[PDB]
Amino acid sequence: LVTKKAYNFTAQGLNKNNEIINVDLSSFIGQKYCCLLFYPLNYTFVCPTEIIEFNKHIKDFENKNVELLGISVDSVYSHLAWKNMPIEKGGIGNVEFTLVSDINKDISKNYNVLYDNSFALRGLFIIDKNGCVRHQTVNDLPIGRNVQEVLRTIDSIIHVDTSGEVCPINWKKGQ
Amino acid sequence: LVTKKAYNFTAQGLNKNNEIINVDLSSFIGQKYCCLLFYPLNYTFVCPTEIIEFNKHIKDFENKNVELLGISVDSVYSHLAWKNMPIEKGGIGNVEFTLVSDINKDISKNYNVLYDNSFALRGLFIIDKNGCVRHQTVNDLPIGRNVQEVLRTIDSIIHVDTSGEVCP
């Protein structure tokens, strides 16, 4: 997937104002980077803590001109219920980014993260302003993502885009 | 590939004593975790510093019972030449882990990291002691990997194996 053109999905999403919107990946072309964050909502593997942590740092994504999109196979109702649920009860609160409903499973399939025709694995992708996939990580299902690591990854991609440098040497940065 | 059994391969490798050996991935099952570090040796994208940094942390991999395997499409000669090349000329030095030669491209193909049927992308996989793929990352070609991040990932996998905690 990395180096190739990202699968351009169209799906319903629930935005930061809890409005149902049509989310079209191609709308961000020439405008914004995207970070696609896939996750499961089954009780065995659900991880509200990682979503809460991404939301805590949402302005860091905004500062970097990155649209964060959470994606799962579950319905718009299911996402709204998760946002409305108390944190103490396993909820995520009213997070400030869009949650996308992959209800036909084609988004997870086309990002190679659909498990058993059932749910999305813990996948993460960074999409650049040309619509190209620039990073792919699939974490072990029980392990949440580290938002600081994701933001550093994004930083490196932005650096490549602005400088064209391959592998830059750390000590020499200044010079 | 994550959650599925790793593609087993048998390939030539150049070990830490610069001997050419047989590298059979299935030989580590029940014995050690493996970290498969794919990389390009292509002039445009070659990144010696990332290999050097992983080598500097080889005692951490050993302490975690992880076999680190560098994999590229290039010959054993190329790997030996790269090890012998001075650092200031783009060499990696005599690294203390095995470099595997994926000459026929089958390993890169089966791990979905072959670019333009030519060279390997910057893929990394962690395989557990049962031979299951537990983590997969593919970095942008111009961007080297961060070994400290890899080591934290391995720590998390080992913690799951020993504790069974979801989302600790």
Author numbering:
A (entry chain B): 21 to 195
B (entry chain A): 21 to 188
Task: Quote the paper.
Peroxiredoxins (Prx) are ubiquitous peroxidases that reduce reactive oxygen and nitrogen species such as hydrogen peroxide, alkyl hydroperoxides and peroxinitrite using an active-site cysteine residue. In 2-Cys peroxiredoxins, this active-site residue is found in the first turn of an α-helix that is able to unwind to form a disulphide bridge with a second cysteine, the resolving cysteine (Cr), close to the C-terminus of the same or another subunit of the dimeric protein. Our results show that PfTrx-Px2 is a thioredoxin-dependent peroxidase with a preference for H2O2 and that it structurally belongs to the class of typical 2-Cys peroxiredoxins. The preference for PfTrx2 suggests that this reductant is the natural substrate of PfTrx-Px2 in contrast to PfTrx1, which, as a cytosolic protein, is unlikely to encounter the mitochondrial peroxidase in vivo.
The structure was solved by the molecular replacement method and refined against X-ray data extending to 1.8 Å resolution as described in Experimental procedures. Each PfTrx-Px2 chain contains five α-helices and nine β-strands arranged as a seven-stranded β-sheet and a pair of strands connected by a short turn. Analysis of the PfTrx-Px2 crystal structure clearly reveals that the protein is in the oxidized state. There is an intermolecular disulphide bond between the peroxidatic cysteine, Cys67 of chain A and the resolving cysteine, Cys187 of chain B. This is mirrored by a corresponding disulphide bond between Cys67 of chain B and Cys187 of chain A. It is known that oxidation of other peroxiredoxins is accompanied by conformational changes in the protein in the form of local unwinding of the Cp helix containing the peroxidatic cysteine, Cys67 and a reorganization of the C-terminus. The electron density maps around Cys187 from the B chain indicate the presence of two alternate positions of the sulphur atom, giving rise to a double conformation of the disulphide bond that may be a manifestation of the mobility necessary for the C-terminal cysteine to resolve the peroxidatic cysteine during the reaction mechanism. There is a conserved glutamic acid residue, Glu70, near to and buried by the disulphide bridge. Its side-chain makes ionic interactions with arginines 142 and 165.
